[PDB]
Every structure is written in C-alpha cells, then in structure tokens.
C-alpha cells in the first residue's frame, strides 16, 4: 500500500500527449525510499498549492497526468497558455491548482535515425476544454470540399509524429511531463490512522 510515485517518474514508457495518461494515486502511504533532487527535474512549479500536500493522502487523491512533448512546448503546460499542445492536446484550466513537473528525456525518447513513436494532434475543429482528452482519428476537413473516399487534397489525418533525434537542440528534444492535481475527499481514506522513524532507529 505504498504510493506508486516511483512508478510515475521512473516509468519505462510515457504516453503520447494527445492520448495523455492519467494515474490515480489514492489510499496509500508515502514511499520513504523514493527520492528526486534538483538535477532530476528541469521544472517543478506549483499553482495555488504547496507540494507538501502530496505527503498525506488521508483526505486527498492525487491524479498524475503524464506525456511527452517538445522542450519548447513545456511552457504551454501552464494556466492560460495557447499553442498546438494547449489548444489541441492537453489543456490546463485558468484556475489550475496543482503542480507541473518536467524533465529532459532525450536519453530515453530519442534514438539515432529518429524516434517517431510519440504523436501530437495537429488539427482540431475547436480547442479542448481543461482536462479534455481527444483520441479520435477522424479525417480533418481543412478546405471547403468535404472528405469522402480519397477525395480532397485538403483533408488531413489529424495526428502528427514527433521526430526526436539525439543531436537536436534542447528546445526540440523530448521532455517528459507530469501534472499533479488534487482531489479533496470528504471521508477519511482507509490508510488513515510510513513514518520518519523508518529511516532512523
């Protein structure tokens, strides 16, 4: 019944941002063996909450949303941003309360010749609402011609491959992103009743 924070940050594979993953962390105790430091993350920003709320889940569920984007797109994982990622892929509310963690993953998510396994949505009829997830693959109609059969040059498959190559500049390297949001509970979790003594006897 340890909180699987280690699984979130050390996961072998991450989701594409258009199909971003959500993991629920609940009714568990903090894992006193898991540690990250300044060198681990390139960003660790909280909005309207102190990250110490992650330590006690007695009245809290934590939701960890994770995915891979470009270094120069991490700035879009913030309240009130625009751009392809915030508009069409993963949108934080204007009143967002939670934390955003990101780190350079060039050493895991790039490879010689390019890694193309990660995708993002390039076209959409309207902007996502906060925390909306759109994994559809309907053909996108960019012109006046409808899209039927193979008709229509201006008809577009809406998902786009990143191409992460290891020698790209840092702004075009892949970054893993974890968004942490907090659910206030009304009844105490069963876990409620994992102590600093575990490290000191």
């Amino acid at each position, epitope marked *: 019944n340890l909180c699987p924070f280690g699984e979130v940050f050390n996961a072998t594979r991450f989701a594409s941002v258009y199909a971003w993953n959500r993991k629920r962390i609940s009714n568990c105790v903090a894992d006193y063996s898991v540690l990250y430091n300044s060198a681990s993350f390139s960003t660790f920003k909280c909005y309207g909450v102190s990250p110490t709320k992650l330590n006690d889940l007695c009245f809290t569920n934590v939701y960890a949303d994770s995915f891979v984007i470009r270094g120069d797109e991490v700035r879009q994982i913030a309240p009130g941003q625009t751009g392809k990622i915030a508009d069409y892929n993963y949108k934080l509310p204007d009143d967002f309360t939670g934390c955003v963690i990101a780190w350079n993953s060039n050493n895991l998510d790039s490879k010689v010749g390019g890694n193309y396994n990660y995708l993002y949505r390039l076209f959409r009829k309207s902007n996502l609402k906060p925390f909306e997830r759109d994994i559809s693959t309907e053909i996108y109609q960019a012109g006046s011609t409808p899209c039927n059969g193979v008709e229509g040059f201006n008809c*577009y498959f809406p998902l786009q*491959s990143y*191409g992460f190559q290891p020698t790209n500049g840092v702004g075009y390297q892949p970054y893993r992103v974890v968004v942490l949001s907090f659910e206030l509970l009304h009844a105490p979790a069963t876990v409620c009743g994992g102590t600093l003594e575990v490290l000191f006897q």
Partner: nanobody
Amino acid sequence: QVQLVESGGGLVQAGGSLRLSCAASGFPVEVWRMEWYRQAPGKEREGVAAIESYGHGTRYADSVKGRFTISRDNAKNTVYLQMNSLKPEDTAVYYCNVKDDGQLAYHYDQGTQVTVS
C-alpha cells in the same frame, strides 16, 4: 542531411503516361504525410495528391481523380506519382513535399518538368 529529389518528368503525347519519383533522404517516408504539388504555366501551385503516414490513406485533387495514383515504397524511401491519361492541362513543374510540421527541425522547406503535347 535531409533531401527530397524529384524525377520522372518528360515530354509525352496527350494520353500517354509518366511516373514521377520523390526520393527522400534523412527521414523515413512513412512517418509523415508526403505530397505532390504542381505549378502550371500561368497558374499558382496546386496540391495534386498526398499519401498520409503509415496506412492512414491517400488524397487526390478532383482534376486528377481516376488518372493519377500516389504510392510509397518504404524500403526505397520513395513516394511515386503514376500519371495515366495525361492531358495538356497536366503540363507543369511537379514538386515533392514532406509535411513534417517543423519536426525536421533544421530542414528549411527543384522539381521535375512534365510537358503533355
């Protein structure tokens, strides 16, 4: 590093056929949508046909529907434009294009001449 090389053009009588080749280097042809354009004398560039990444499909301008076929050989890293039943209105310079959306970060986006008698 990253290169698109068009070939296959020529001068052919109306009703004949050609096959254009777009040989790509520096990226896999199948990961992004690949496209054929043409610019005819006295006109602006026109999208002719496109082949989406992987098996997500092909697209054709109405003017070439039933006459042109776009295809892709992954092993040769080449996109093809098979042109049958050529008409004088198909006379143009034809160009290849990759829709990388800036994912070929250091590649800033020659053509092959088709003349139908």
